[PDB]
Design an enzyme around this catalytic site. Structure first.
Site, PDB file in Angstrom:
ATOM      1  N   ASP B  69      -8.123 -18.987  -9.276  1.00 37.25           N
ATOM      2  CA  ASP B  69      -9.388 -19.468  -8.738  1.00 37.25           C
ATOM      3  C   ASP B  69     -10.373 -19.881  -9.818  1.00 37.25           C
ATOM      4  O   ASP B  69     -11.355 -20.563  -9.511  1.00 37.25           O
ATOM      5  CB  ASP B  69     -10.018 -18.377  -7.885  1.00 37.25           C
ATOM      6  CG  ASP B  69     -10.038 -17.038  -8.596  1.00 37.25           C
ATOM      7  OD1 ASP B  69      -8.960 -16.591  -9.045  1.00 37.25           O
ATOM      8  OD2 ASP B  69     -11.128 -16.441  -8.720  1.00 37.25           O
ATOM      9  N   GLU B 196     -18.972 -13.786  -0.336  1.00 39.15           N
ATOM     10  CA  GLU B 196     -18.795 -15.081   0.318  1.00 39.15           C
ATOM     11  C   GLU B 196     -19.495 -15.127   1.678  1.00 39.15           C
ATOM     12  O   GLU B 196     -18.875 -15.291   2.731  1.00 39.15           O
ATOM     13  CB  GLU B 196     -17.305 -15.404   0.447  1.00 39.15           C
ATOM     14  CG  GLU B 196     -16.569 -15.334  -0.881  1.00 39.15           C
ATOM     15  CD  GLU B 196     -15.067 -15.289  -0.718  1.00 39.15           C
ATOM     16  OE1 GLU B 196     -14.598 -15.014   0.406  1.00 39.15           O
ATOM     17  OE2 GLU B 196     -14.355 -15.526  -1.717  1.00 39.15           O
ATOM     18  N   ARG B 211     -18.150 -11.032   3.960  1.00 36.70           N
ATOM     19  CA  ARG B 211     -16.789 -10.516   3.929  1.00 36.70           C
ATOM     20  C   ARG B 211     -16.783  -9.209   3.152  1.00 36.70           C
ATOM     21  O   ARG B 211     -17.232  -9.163   2.002  1.00 36.70           O
ATOM     22  CB  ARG B 211     -15.847 -11.539   3.289  1.00 36.70           C
ATOM     23  CG  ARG B 211     -14.635 -10.964   2.567  1.00 36.70           C
ATOM     24  CD  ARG B 211     -13.907 -12.071   1.821  1.00 36.70           C
ATOM     25  NE  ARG B 211     -12.741 -11.592   1.089  1.00 36.70           N
ATOM     26  CZ  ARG B 211     -11.890 -12.384   0.445  1.00 36.70           C
ATOM     27  NH1 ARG B 211     -12.070 -13.698   0.450  1.00 36.70           N
ATOM     28  NH2 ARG B 211     -10.851 -11.865  -0.196  1.00 36.70           N
ATOM     29  N   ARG B 286      -3.032 -15.445   7.138  1.00 36.49           N
ATOM     30  CA  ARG B 286      -4.086 -16.407   7.452  1.00 36.49           C
ATOM     31  C   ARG B 286      -3.504 -17.529   8.312  1.00 36.49           C
ATOM     32  O   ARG B 286      -3.271 -18.654   7.866  1.00 36.49           O
ATOM     33  CB  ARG B 286      -4.706 -16.940   6.170  1.00 36.49           C
ATOM     34  CG  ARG B 286      -5.288 -15.863   5.277  1.00 36.49           C
ATOM     35  CD  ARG B 286      -5.869 -16.450   4.000  1.00 36.49           C
ATOM     36  NE  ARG B 286      -6.665 -15.466   3.278  1.00 36.49           N
ATOM     37  CZ  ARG B 286      -7.383 -15.732   2.192  1.00 36.49           C
ATOM     38  NH1 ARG B 286      -7.402 -16.959   1.693  1.00 36.49           N
ATOM     39  NH2 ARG B 286      -8.079 -14.770   1.604  1.00 36.49           N
ATOM     40  N   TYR B 320     -10.296 -20.060   4.749  1.00 44.18           N
ATOM     41  CA  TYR B 320     -11.728 -19.804   4.766  1.00 44.18           C
ATOM     42  C   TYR B 320     -12.399 -20.501   5.943  1.00 44.18           C
ATOM     43  O   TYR B 320     -11.968 -21.563   6.398  1.00 44.18           O
ATOM     44  CB  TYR B 320     -12.370 -20.277   3.465  1.00 44.18           C
ATOM     45  CG  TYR B 320     -12.329 -19.270   2.349  1.00 44.18           C
ATOM     46  CD1 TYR B 320     -11.543 -18.130   2.441  1.00 44.18           C
ATOM     47  CD2 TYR B 320     -13.084 -19.456   1.202  1.00 44.18           C
ATOM     48  CE1 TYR B 320     -11.510 -17.206   1.420  1.00 44.18           C
ATOM     49  CE2 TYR B 320     -13.057 -18.540   0.178  1.00 44.18           C
ATOM     50  CZ  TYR B 320     -12.270 -17.419   0.291  1.00 44.18           C
ATOM     51  OH  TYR B 320     -12.255 -16.513  -0.737  1.00 44.18           O
TER      52      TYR B 320
END
Ligand SMILES: [Ca+2]
Ligand SMILES: [Ca+2]
Lengths: 211, 387
Positions: B69, B196, B211, B286, B320
């Protein structure tokens, strides 16, 4: 961080037994990644307990885990002879990322005693011609594998040049060990005799050789 | 003219689809940035899609290992909505591996975080001019909403986190005016975890849904006014909003420790004690996305809800999600309307590729007829660069 474990625990068949990890429970809002392992001699560890009360598929339900305060415990119900192995606990912390415990040797009692069969060899003529001498004392078929060896020459104890192995389990579930006494060819034939005394559970068996 | 922001959220009864860019599908042939953490933010004239590039294009060798990231090559860039994030249509905003952006009504405010993990610095830009900076105060990775910030009366607000991702960290609220940090408060929230956040203005105040990556399967929230007086808490609903989570069960107004370990960026819209919850369909991965209306979920702990609208099929990749609003200055309505976007993560770790990227879909709340469906990414993986 260190996980402390009892060095040895012992139980009989049918008996239940509890080993106790007494290390990491730390860091209040962090979780508990605690796990247990079983290891038989000469084989890789086997995951018995993780996530402290969880147990993976295939593991007997006689094994269970718990934790209270800073102490985790592995409870084994209905002790069987195959449960005799080494047990380790583990834990993941932010500080240290895993810590395997010192280990606990689990002994399943009830098995009969066995005195050691001792054989003692004098040095060969071929070794003395090379100006070397070595006494071979061989310990066989004793139960359990705990023994100590003392060498002597005409009732006088000798410490110099003694190399003794650690006991090892045979194929018949009894143990074996060997001891070696190194001598110059003068020390061998100048003395009257040499003896290897093998004391096992207070009972001492002795063998003697002489030139 | 400045964005007043004194209107309450428009009451909604559904979600109508707003945009779909089809990035990764078009990335197989066209020149498309490898992106991740996209979000939408609107001015009183237009709406734009901000995103964190990886300094590389899809189906190129430089998209290798783009799981990480944080790198000196990631940049915050923006393009019109529903458009593919290509170097030929994307505007540059800031060098960042963690970003946030919003429009106070006269100029784009962009927050770009770059630097080392122990010394990360957030570069604040107002109209692309550097107006302020703020340095990491706990020397553990400094991060921000990865969604739009919220502006009221000419002041914009955001949340930043400094410290561990698997434990107690430090969380601060900021009040930016024309890109200049004018006030900040560190939250007194022991046993809470904020990451976030999805912040939206609501009748002169701001409420962020965040979160909990440390011990939370429900979502933490923080609301505050212009003086940064704040209130904290967790969504009490038994319809858990984080991913992973447990099955729907009795909830808690505190952090739910069951499956409380690391989560996914999400959002929620509070309406009195009701809540519109956007969450994945799967409990572990996810996968899928849905909107759930719980009429008492904000303060009640039961698992009952009255409305559910499908967004992405349970079998298809999601990621996300974040909130973004359309102010009355833009829409001509008499209330600030809520909308939201969904990131569709493709590739690593779940798929056999050398890369990770995402596309986006977005929906806006309307008080009219809607329908549930599945609007997935649709790219056929692996790509030619993965062979
Ligand atoms: Ca979580
Ligand atoms: Ca309910």
């Amino acid at each position: 961080s260190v996980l402390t474990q009892p060095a040895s625990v012992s139980g009989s068949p049918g008996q239940s037994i509890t080993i106790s990890c007494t290390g990491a429970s730390s860091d209040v809002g962090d979780y508990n990644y605690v796990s247990w392992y079983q290891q038989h001699p000469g084989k890789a560890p086997k995951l018995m307990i993780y996530d402290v009360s969880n147990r993976p598929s295939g593991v007997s339900n006689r094994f269970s885990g718990s934790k209270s305060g800073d102490t985790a415990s592995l409870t084994i119900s209905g002790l069987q002879a195959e449960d005799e192995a080494d047990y380790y606990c583990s834990s993941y912390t932010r500080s240290s990322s895993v810590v395997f415990g010192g280990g606990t040797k689990l002994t399943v009692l009830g098995q009969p005693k066995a005195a050691p069969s001792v054989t003692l060899f004098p040095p060969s003529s071929e070794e003395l011609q090379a100006n070397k001498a070595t006494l071979v004392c061989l310990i066989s078929d004793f139960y359990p594998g705990a023994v100590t060896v003392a060498w002597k020459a005409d009732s006088s104890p000798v410490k110099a040049g003694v190399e003794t192995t650690t006991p090892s389990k045979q194929s018949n579930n009894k143990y074996a060990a060997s001891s070696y006494l190194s001598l110059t060819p003068e020390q061998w034939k100048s003395h009257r005799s040499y003896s290897c005394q093998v004391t096992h559970e207070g009972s001492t068996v002795e063998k003697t050789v002489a030139p | 003219v400045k964005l007043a922001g004194n209107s309450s959220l428009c009451p909604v009864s559904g979600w109508a689809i707003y945009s779909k860019d089809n990035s990764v599908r078009i990335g197989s042939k066209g020149d498309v940035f490898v992106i991740r953490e996209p979000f939408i933010s609107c001015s009183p004239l237009e709406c734009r899609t901000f995103f964190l590039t990886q300094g590389a294009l899809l189906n190129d060798k430089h998209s290798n290992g783009t799981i990480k990231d944080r790198s000196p090559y990631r940049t915050l860039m923006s393009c019109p909505i529903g458009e593919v994030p290509s170097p030929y249509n994307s505007r540059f905003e800031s060098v960042a591996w963690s970003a946030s952006a919003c429009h106070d009504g006269i100029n784009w405010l962009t927050i770009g975080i770059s630097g080392p993990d122990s010394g990360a610095v957030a570069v604040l830009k107002y109209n692309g001019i550097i107006t302020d900076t703020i340095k990491s105060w706990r020397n553990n990775i400094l991060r921000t909403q990865e969604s739009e910030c919220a502006c009221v009366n000419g002041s914009c607000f955001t949340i930043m986190t400094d410290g561990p991702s698997d434990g107690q960290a430090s969380y601060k609220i900021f009040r930016i005016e024309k890109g200049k940090i004018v006030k900040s408060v560190e939250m007194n929230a022991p046993n809470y975890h904020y990451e976030e956040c999805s912040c939206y203005p609501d009748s002169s105040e701001i409420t962020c849904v965040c979160r909990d990556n440390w011990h939370g399967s429900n979502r933490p929230w923080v609301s505050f006014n212009q003086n940064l007086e704040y209130q904290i808490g967790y969504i009490c609903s038994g319809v858990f909003g984080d991913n992973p989570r447990p099955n729907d069960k009795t909830g808690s107004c505190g952090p739910v420790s069951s499956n409380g370990a690391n989560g996914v960026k999400g959002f929620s819209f509070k309406y009195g004690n009701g809540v519109w919850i956007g969450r994945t369909k799967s409990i572990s991965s996810r996968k899928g996305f849905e909107m759930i209306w719980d009429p008492n979920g904000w303060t009640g702990t039961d698992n009952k809800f009255s409305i559910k609208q499908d967004i992405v099929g349970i079998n298809e990749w999601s990621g996300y999600s974040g909130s973004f609003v359309q102010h009355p200055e833009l829409t001509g309505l008499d209330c600030i309307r809520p909308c939201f976007w969904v990131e569709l993560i493709r590739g690593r770790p779940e798929e056999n590729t050398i890369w990770t990227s995402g596309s986006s879909i977005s929906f806006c709340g309307v008080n009219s007829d809607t329908v549930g469906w599945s609007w997935p990414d649709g790219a056929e993986l692996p790509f030619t660069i993965d062979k």
